[PDB]
Design a protein around this ligand. Sequence first.
Ligand code: ADP
Ligand code: ADP
Ligand code: MG
Lengths: 537, 98, 49, 526
Amino acid sequence: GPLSVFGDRSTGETIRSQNVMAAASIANIVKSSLGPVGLDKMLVDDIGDVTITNDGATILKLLEVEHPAAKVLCELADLQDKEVGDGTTSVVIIAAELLKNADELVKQKIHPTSVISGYRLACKEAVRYINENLIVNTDELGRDCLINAAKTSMSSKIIGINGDFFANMVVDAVLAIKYTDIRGQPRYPVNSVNILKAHGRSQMESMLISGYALNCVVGSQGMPKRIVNAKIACLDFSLQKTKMKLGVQVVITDPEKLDQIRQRESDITKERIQKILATGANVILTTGGIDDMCLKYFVEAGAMAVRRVLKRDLKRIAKASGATILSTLANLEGEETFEAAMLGQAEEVVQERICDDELILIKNTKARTSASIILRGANDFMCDEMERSLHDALCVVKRVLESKSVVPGGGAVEAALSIYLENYATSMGSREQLAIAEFARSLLVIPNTLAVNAAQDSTDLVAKLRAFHNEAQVNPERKNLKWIGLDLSNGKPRDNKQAGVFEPTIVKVKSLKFATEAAITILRIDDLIKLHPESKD
Amino acid sequence: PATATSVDLRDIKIVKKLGGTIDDCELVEGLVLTQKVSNSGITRVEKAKIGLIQFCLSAPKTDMDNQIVVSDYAQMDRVLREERAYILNLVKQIKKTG
Amino acid sequence: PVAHIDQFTADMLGSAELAEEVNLNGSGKLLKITGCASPGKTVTIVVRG
Amino acid sequence: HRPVLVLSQNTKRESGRKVQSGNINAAKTIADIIRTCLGPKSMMKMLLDPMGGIVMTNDGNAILREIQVQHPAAKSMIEISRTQDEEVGDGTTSVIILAGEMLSVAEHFLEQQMHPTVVISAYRKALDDMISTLKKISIPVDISDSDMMLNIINSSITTKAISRWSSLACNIALDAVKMVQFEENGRKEIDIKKYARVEKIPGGIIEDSCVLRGVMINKDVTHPRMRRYIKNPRIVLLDSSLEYKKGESQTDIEITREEDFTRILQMEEEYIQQLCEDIIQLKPDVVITEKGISDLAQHYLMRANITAIRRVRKTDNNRIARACGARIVSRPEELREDDVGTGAGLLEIKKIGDEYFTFITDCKDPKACTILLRGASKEILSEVERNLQDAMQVCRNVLLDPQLVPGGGASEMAVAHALTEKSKAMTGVEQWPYRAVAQALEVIPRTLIQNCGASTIRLLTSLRAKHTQENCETWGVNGETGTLVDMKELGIWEPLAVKLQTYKTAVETAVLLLRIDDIVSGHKKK
Ligand SMILES: Nc1ncnc2c1ncn2[C@@H]1O[C@H](COP(=O)(O)OP(=O)(O)O)[C@@H](O)[C@H]1O
Ligand SMILES: Nc1ncnc2c1ncn2[C@@H]1O[C@H](COP(=O)(O)OP(=O)(O)O)[C@@H](O)[C@H]1O
Ligand SMILES: [Mg+2]
């Protein structure tokens, strides 16, 4: 008679209501952490680890979910960090409100394929409207565009100060790592900025180290911890005792040749350590291991030897200081040459006091003038929040300097798209105008969430917000009301052009493309079959 | 076409990568590999000549059990320096090919 | 396919107008060979999402 | 059994006023634990640890490290006192009471329908003005003066349990920092954790405890024929062993003839004689290594009259290398004349309570010393060790920043009147939470009179009126008697780095705990 599947089968509008409540279970969590009036949360593990954060990526990654429609929105926040770098809170609220308004359409006996086809006419038109109504590129504003875009990202986090202390440390970090590529590509690799945490003084004592800040120790306490005019020798091979391989063994037939082999295991080792040190190298970085016998040759010669450093940290030092990452001996059948003209350079390599730890700093590196940021907080919970907030701020200045285009934030984009898509559905709307009209109401939840978290007027401030954007589209008398946003400190519509609330273009372009594509997949779960877990059989 | 009535779909590889939208799909007629490049200091070469090598560029070893007998002071120098000269003859044989 | 190093000659090599590692913004990066002399009856489809 | 289709299984959700006012009560609870451990009239608090020991202390950091809490906002306050303990010495307790009071006045404005971002933006404006006020009321210190530095460290140990032996603990803690003040290249560094070892021995009296001019270790001589009393030794420090061990290879010998097995056992004896002949070319007196010494190596050092110590630790070898001026070598055939630690004074293998101790003291110019503590038991010797750690770090802050702030309540009330007069030009909604920061700083002179039993109404009215005039402004609370004495006559002075780190950590703790409106507990990790 019925299906003989050993699991569970639920069809009809039951799963069509369960997927919306699964998406609203995620959106109602992160709705209290959006905008400058957003508040952080607590992520307590079963073992007791506390993670205080407010970014939409760290919350949904550590939180475990069970529903299959909930895993789509949790992986949607993970893609926003890779593609853009912030947005993991705004994409999750839009994609869940896209399913909430489409649930109201499919309960009116409207087919969901018209909602999918209606959302594509609204998503492609919203990207087309935001690319023809941008304010200005990065030539008229200059350096004021990079500071105002950085302060917009920090307003939802712990580093949202009224001054320009944290804003200037992010702009000067991305501007110091400008690495040009082939075919005219001025790329800005934000992963090269070493973000370090240390529970020390207040947030106003966060150092901006022009150079690199290595998170390692010297080791033996007989080496000079400060070397001025240093020559960095970046190498990756373990300076240890010379051990033979698996295919090589020592089989001796005469006891007189015993001590000559035992001394050869250290004489070959000390042969490499004398030809990489007599060429003027003072700082030696090693990703392998330097044992206690090899530490004697640096204390006697007065050189700094750092051992067991990261492979990702050695590449950022050797590229910024002009050093060559050497692994072994080379250069056309030479015994030990080392290519001494390929040594790095540094102005000063100084191990400073970082509140009961050891931290090695390199000053300006003499080749590329890189930068590293040492963050300072009150405890480990603030320093983990300061690291995630700084990484979201580095991604804003990366996309603005690469793609010289900004849009006004604070609900100014969503207010103009809410009125343009209603008039877009009036002309060419026969059976899909109801899906384009609900795409405009789903976009209105971004200024609606800012009114709830600020404890301001909800249905009056956003109604006054769309009153300015309606006059900028039906009365072409150069009103320039396209940059009207929200002033959550006063509760009135402000002009984001003069106030300096700037966001990148692809933080709203890729947000509307990812939320529309995620809403299509969850809209096609009209039938759902859940099998029993095959653990005990 | 107009020569055969069969088509093998195993000659059409499909690479699944997470990121972007469905409009970012590509129909590149060449080879797409998911492996990483070691070392990744270059990652671009024009007018490239690609060669598939099934030989292992490492220390010499045979299918039979092979051991090295070291019973002299200078015999340890003849192990490491001859292994460097072996693979140097393999790289220079590759480099002189072009 | 070259197995022994004594038979590694220029006739067993290929050709490529561009062999670069496209640094993607998403899940890592991949290789992409663009153009080759006498292309075979093979093709590759890159699917995103 | 069909399972229930749920989402986020086995977790909790809490939001609203239950979390904003819930983190305040978790912070007020820890402020009531160490409230009786702030002034000079404080009392000890006996603790019990699951290892089996007993911690009887009154320092605010050592109390909170033995408390295991389950609340997440209560775990944040424990890491605040750990941050204050690693930055400065005597700056921990004062932060937990101040962060509990700045959150106490912050709970009042959360009931007035005020957003937490408005109170934090008023806290950051008040934080920037407390730093500028302490720099105006500071006083430069002559670090070359000996009696001036004794009055600074006496102000930090009057609270602790070593206030009875104030004439002894001030001279030990001052001379310990001035010996380890090392400067090789162009950078001044003070390492009081790797070079200022505090060794405690149960027995004797506390008045006989003194800082040695050198190091000491709990190691006896390797052979009884070796000397236990050398006047001027030439100490050579080693790192490798003096034995014959297996090499890092696959060495295997095929013995075919009869003379081959006896030759290998003779080459093992000749290898020890080769390295023992290389270390006696410099004519040493004391050989100290980190690894084992065989009996054949003891035979050559016996007839050469060399005292050998066997298994000294790695951390003790770096400390004796700075005291005697030696260099730790790891190769006996690569020894040089600069690697010999000349200048060491009297070396004597004494015995203290059926256990030998190697004393290397009376050095000419040591860069590392060892404080020899002797007391009644291991219980109170751990108290003096934790108090001398808070007594040596407060001397390190003066040598890095020679500025003093008038403590004992005079520091907190001088800024509380500065924030009150500066709040008159606000004219906004952030004016009222700005006024609560000045009222929250008053809890530090409130705690000095609640511990000695003085009145809290009759004293706060007279102390607040003293800071109305701009003349004196340095009047604090005398914790000994209970009246109002000026701090220019008592001598209670706290360093600037202690007072700056106290205010910077108490405000930013209130910044972190006020932005928390949600708590999710019940998820697992990898
Ligand atoms: N000064 C401001 N005025 C008004 N709105 C702001 C201001 N600063 C930030 N916002 C808003 O707060 C929101 C924060 O979004 P966010 O959670 O950072 O997105 P994501 O999670 O993708 O990083 C932005 O959409 C922006 O419109
Ligand atoms: N003789 C005294 N008169 C008045 N106040 C004193 C006296 N001695 C100490 N105090 C006060 O007692 C407080 C003790 O603080 P303490 O708990 O040692 O801080 P921390 O925990 O950072 O070491 C100091 O702030 C100081 O003002
Ligand atoms: Mg943001």
